[PDB]
Amino acid sequence: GIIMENVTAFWEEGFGELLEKVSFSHLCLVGNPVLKNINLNIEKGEMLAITGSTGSGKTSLLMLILGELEASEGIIKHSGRVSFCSQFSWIMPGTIKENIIFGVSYDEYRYKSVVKACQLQQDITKFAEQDNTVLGEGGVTLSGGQRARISLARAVYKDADLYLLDSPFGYLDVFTEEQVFESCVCKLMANKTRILVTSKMEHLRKADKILILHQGSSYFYGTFSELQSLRPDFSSKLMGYDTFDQFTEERRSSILTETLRRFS
């Protein structure tokens, strides 16, 4: 499981460099918080959806769990192997397969089931060599979604206790992404403790807990139901869109941000 009791963390010199790699020294000198009074309790097998305004601390909270940012006040409790899957989808030179099982024991069943749920079948079938196509470093002629699904597969194949998925559903092939959410994150991963950063409303619905950050602070925590009751101005605005989850990542963040400001 993963517990966070009143946690706060400050700009440490060097942290913002890592945040580029995944002005800073002014935030460091001045001593601001990057997250502030963060609280959450996720029990084994639960799925936490994290969302919020753009630049609100979401990736920084993942760096906290990974142990890259140092929590000044608070307790952070969790244990085991943790599998991280960043926004930036990196690709090592080698085959699509090699990339997915990087430095980890092959397991024909486990592999086929990840490859499958992550919607990579539609993809590797396009290629003369299937999942034995060799990729150049950075996976460059691929699409943004293709890289993202390769990077997700790689991360989900890893066997671990906690899975941190940072924003893999933000590209244009929006239906595949709906498939992937459902087969991978919701079915195949259903028994694994997993945190998902996201700007799609659907993911909030189907989650166990929810965390919405804004200007570094927790603007909400607790379940999807509580969200509608407790922050209703929020809930009205967002839920009352036609197909908000098929807006671009860019437009979804814009509204989340404009909305979080209105009702602070």
In whole angstroms, give the CA distance from residue 153 to residue 157.
6
Residue 58 near Mg ion by CB under 5 A: yes
Contact 189, 153 (CB under 8 A): no
**Is residue 203 classed as helix, strand or coil in its secondary structure?**
helix
Least separation in angstroms between residue 70's CB and ligand ATP is 15
Residue 89 near Mg ion by CB under 5 A: no
Taking CB within 5 to 8 Å according to partner kind, which of ligand ATP, Mg ion, none is near residue 60? Answer: ligand ATP
Q: Is 135 or 212 the residue whose CB approaches ligand ATP more closely?
A: 212
Least separation in angstroms between residue 177's CB and ligand ATP is 17
Least separation in angstroms between residue 199's CB and Mg ion is 10
The two structure tokens encoding residue 190? 């259903």
HEC per residue, 117-163 = HCCCHHHHCCCCCHHHCEECCCCCCCCHHHHHHHHHHHHHHCCCCEE
Residue 19 near ligand ATP by CB under 6 A: yes
Q: Is 120 or 169 the residue whose CB approaches Mg ion more closely?
A: 169
Taking CB within 5 to 8 Å according to partner kind, which of ligand ATP, Mg ion, none is near residue 56? Answer: ligand ATP
> What mask of x and - would describe binding to ligand ATP in positions 25 to 64, judged by CB under 6 A?
-----------------------------xxxxxxx----
Residue found by looking up tokens 């396009």 in the block: 126
> For Mg ion, how many residues bind (rule: CB under 5 A)?
2
Q: Residue 98: is it exposed, middle or buried by C-beta count within 10 angstroms (0-12/13-18/19+)? A: middle
Least separation in angstroms between residue 198's CB and Mg ion is 10
Residue 53 near Mg ion by CB under 5 A: no
Least separation in angstroms between residue 91's CB and Mg ion is 20
In whole angstroms, give the CA distance from residue 209 to residue 161.
18
Q: Which residue is nearest to Mg ion (CB)?
A: 59
The two structure tokens encoding residue 57? 């601390």
Q: Residue 229: is it exposed, middle or buried by C-beta count within 10 angstroms (0-12/13-18/19+)? A: exposed
Residue 59 near Mg ion by CB under 5 A: yes
Q: Which residues bind Mg ion (CB under 5 A)?
A: 58-59
Q: Which residues bind ligand ATP (CB under 6 A)?
A: 19-20, 54-60
